[PDB]
Write a protein that binds this ligand. Structure first.
Ligand SMILES: Nc1ncnc2c1ncn2[C@@H]1O[C@H](COP(=O)(O)OP(=O)(O)NP(=O)(O)O)[C@@H](O)[C@H]1O
Ligand SMILES: Nc1ncnc2c1ncn2[C@@H]1O[C@H](COP(=O)(O)OP(=O)(O)NP(=O)(O)O)[C@@H](O)[C@H]1O
Ligand SMILES: Cc1cn([C@H]2C[C@H](O)[C@@H](COP(=O)(O)O)O2)c(=O)[nH]c1=O
Ligand SMILES: Cc1cn([C@H]2C[C@H](O)[C@@H](COP(=O)(O)O)O2)c(=O)[nH]c1=O
Ligand SMILES: [Mg+2]
Ligand SMILES: [Mg+2]
Ligand SMILES: [Mg+2]
Lengths: 210, 210
């Protein structure tokens, strides 16, 4: 019985990850697929609540601890992810382990190797879309929030980390020109996604970074 | 200004870790040292509360997630640990990263390498005491609780993992014959501890597993 695809959307802030993740699930379902949306962090769980308070600057959390909470927040959803994929449901995920590594890896004294480890073994995405946008016109997309990491210097360091992760050819990375209209970007993403659902799925679900 | 020593007590269950950790701090303070007690998990924090509920079987937690919460529970205390040691306070710690690895490593499909990673970089103990006791007479020490992991089969697997970690000569492991009286075991531990406080401290605090 045909498994669903695990599709992740990544990108710096204001690239369009959440808008395109919502539109993608809508379109896939309208075209007869079974598809559902997930996002990380998943702020509804106990761990998710700690992460939400940290990101809102309502609480401070030691940098290594918070990194591990972001990873645990993904692991607590692994039984659900595997169940849905095995049932033939494609999952569209707004941020995943790559944001986990890029954001902590932007802090001083955090190696990419250490940042990756907690997430080693997670379900491996069949397609990782990276929504590219000059940090500049991304900045044309309204302005910064009061949330953690919402500043230019930090975003640039995270962006450097994302390009280090893209050197990883064990992963099906696809660059998306997120500077176009919402509808144009959506169509690029939708076509890539239909190909992965069909093809990428002929092989068993993989394990990330192993 | 002379730093304090980081002393950890490890062992299977009912070996005497908590009794000897309390007696050690008492004795050191009576002999003029500045020493304080710590334990892991530290159940008072938000993460600690999640761990306490899991161990009491009041809640179920995905195995990878709970492993990462145990590690984050140590990291959230690192600023305090470093501050106390730099102030000349010796810290006696009832369980540490070694229990973290041995307990998750006893579960199926968990490699010691993956289990170790989250804790790579923690403050490195200057002395790791391992309280040895036949799992048998340990069993003479009353009986099992209703808490998680409190069964013979699981304890044996954890014990095998502890012996794998002892092959690590980057660490100052000392075996303690925990089958003797509380006072006799205490005296062995106290003498080893005084030596580490004096000597082990001439070098800067190290980083675990790196
Ligand atoms: N292609 C686009 N052109 C112009 N504006 C866009 C485009 N895509 C999204 N936006 C707008 O830009 C803002 C950010 O979009 P959103 O999809 O929330 O980004 P995001 O990548 O999830 N940001 P964040 O979660 O903060 O990193 C919203 O007001 C969107 O309406
Ligand atoms: N040397 C000893 N001889 C006999 N009983 C002992 C000895 N040391 C401790 N005990 C008793 O054995 C029980 C377990 O001691 P305790 O110090 O709490 O062990 P622990 O190693 O912290 N156990 P756990 O935390 O469950 O792995 C207590 O009732 C102690 O009084
Ligand atoms: C998933 C994830 C996100 N992040 C960040 C990126 C964003 O600042 C934030 C999520 O913001 P959002 O929930 O408003 O989209 O958390 C991490 O630092 N680590 C992670 O593992
Ligand atoms: C510190 C630590 C303990 N443990 C276990 C060993 C014990 O079962 C338990 C602590 O029990 P206790 O708080 O009653 O001493 O948690 C882990 O599994 N991982 C860890 O990182
Ligand atoms: Mg978003
Ligand atoms: Mg104890
Ligand atoms: Mg490694």
């Amino acid at each position: 019985a045909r498994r669903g695809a695990l599709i992740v959307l990544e990108g710096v802030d204001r690239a369009g990850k959440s808008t395109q993740s919502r539109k993608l699930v809508e379109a896939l379902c309208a075209a007869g697929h079974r598809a559902e949306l997930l996002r990380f962090p998943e702020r509804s769980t106990e761990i998710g609540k700690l992460l939400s308070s940290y990101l809102q600057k309502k609480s401070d959390v030691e940098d290594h601890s918070v990194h591990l909470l972001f990873s645990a927040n993904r692991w607590e959803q692994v039984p659900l992810i595997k169940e849905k994929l095995s049932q033939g449901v494609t999952l569209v995920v707004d941020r995943y382990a790559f944001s986990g590594v890029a954001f902590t890896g932007a802090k001083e004294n955090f190696s990419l190797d250490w940042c990756k480890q907690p997430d080693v073994g997670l379900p491996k995405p069949d397609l990782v879309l990276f929504l590219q946008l000059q940090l500049a016109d991304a900045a044309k997309r309204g302005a910064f929030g009061h949330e953690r990491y919402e500043n230019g210097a930090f975003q640039e360091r995270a962006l450097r980390c994302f390009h280090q992760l893209m050197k990883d050819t064990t992963l099906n990375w696809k660059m998306v020109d997120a500077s176009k209209s919402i509808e144009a970007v959506h169509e690029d993403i939708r076509v890539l996604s239909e190909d992965a659902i069909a093809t990428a799925t002929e092989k068993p679900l993989g394990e990330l970074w192993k």
